């Protein structure tokens, strides 16, 4: 409340360490369905079921330009990526897989770096 704060976590470096989760994402041989925005003319579905598109490409765009406010909020867009995958893919197809591959990938990075 006003003047009674908890202490202060030192954040200072997290704009880098997201950027090296994100680079270790974007090398993972299971990126591929992620790397790039899906393409709205050329697949079927995607445009009207997956109300809020997201890749790699667009978080590295947004980090690298101040459009996250926080960790959380990068926390959010990646995983978002992993949920429209499971919304528009089956489970058992490689991309469907490589989804569920990666979020745990994340996950992990995430708990290790900052948990």
């Known amino acids: 409340s006003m003047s009674v704060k908890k202490p202060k976590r030192d ?6 360490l997201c950027s090296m ?7 993972h041989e299971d990126a591929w369905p992620f790397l790039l925005p899906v393409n709205l003319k ?5 445009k009207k ?3 809020k598109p997201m890749d790699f490409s667009t978080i590295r765009e ?3 330009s101040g459009q996250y406010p ?18 528009f893919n089956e489970d058992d197809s490689d991309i469907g897989r490589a989804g569920h ?4 990938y994340f996950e992990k990075k995430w708990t290790d770096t900052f948990k």
């Not at 989760?21 to 090398?27: A, F, N």
């Open 11 to 16: 954040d200072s470096k997290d704009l880098a």
């Open 21 to 27: 989760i994100l680079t270790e994402m974007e090398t």
């Open 42 to 46: 050329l697949v079927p579905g995607y």
């Open 49 to 51: 079921v997956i109300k």
């Open 62 to 64: 947004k980090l690298s």
């Open 70 to 87: 926080n960790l959380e909020t990068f926390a959010l867009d990646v995983r978002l990526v992993f949920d429209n995958c499971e919304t």
């Open 101 to 104: 591959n990666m979020r745990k």
